[PDB]
Amino acid sequence: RRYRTTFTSFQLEELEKAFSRTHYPDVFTREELAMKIGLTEARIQVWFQNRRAKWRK
Amino acid sequence: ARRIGHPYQNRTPPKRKKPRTSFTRIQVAELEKRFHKQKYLASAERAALARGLKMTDAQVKTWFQNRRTKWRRQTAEE
DNA sequence: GGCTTAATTAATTGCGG
DNA sequence: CCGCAATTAATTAAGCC
Structure with a gap:
């Protein structure tokens, strides 16, 4: 029952597209994305964190 | 005020x-x-x-650092 | 109940003060 | 020394199938 973001299919779209460019975007890109898809920076920071973990293994 | 630091790939790999x-x-x-x-x-x-919670110095120092990160990320997360 | 995955935790490296 | 950015390996748990 702890909070848990479900991403729109649009924002999931933009996250995967960005991850495709760099696997380590800088803070400003992250921010710019956040505005562009209505999530806060921290949600994106974690997404990228988790997503990278997936990739590595 | 943004005071950005150094990217992770350039660091020498950790020794956990x-x-x-x-x-x-x-x-x-x-x-x-x-x-x-x-x-x-x-x-x-x-x-x-630390000495009174039987933790090390590093541990309390790190806990404190990690707490502040959480704190700010919460503060300015409105 | 399994499984993927968002969230959380204790750690690290190295600048800039 | 110290904070802090920027990251990880591990985990805890939400909620689809």
Whole structure:
């Protein structure tokens, strides 16, 4: 029952597209994305964190 | 004010050695209690806080650093 | 109940003060 | 020394199938 973001299919779209460019975007890109898809920076920071973990293994 | 730092790929790979500790709820709840009235700890008083929660110095120092990160990320997360 | 995955935790490296 | 950015390996748990 702890909070848990479900991403729109649009924002999931933009996250995967960005991850495709760099696997380590800088803070400003992250921010710019956040505005562009209505999530806060921290949600994106974690997404990228988790997503990278997936990739590595 | 943004004071950005250095990218991770350029760093030399970590040496995690090692053990994955997890602080007891009393350890935790004391830390949180102190945090509420004091966001920064001078070294001597960090030493005392640790010595009295049977944690190391590094551990309290790191806990404090990680707490502040959470704190700000919460503060300015409106 | 399994499984993927968002969230959380204790750690690290290295600048800039 | 110290904070802090920027990251990880591990985990905890939400909620689809």
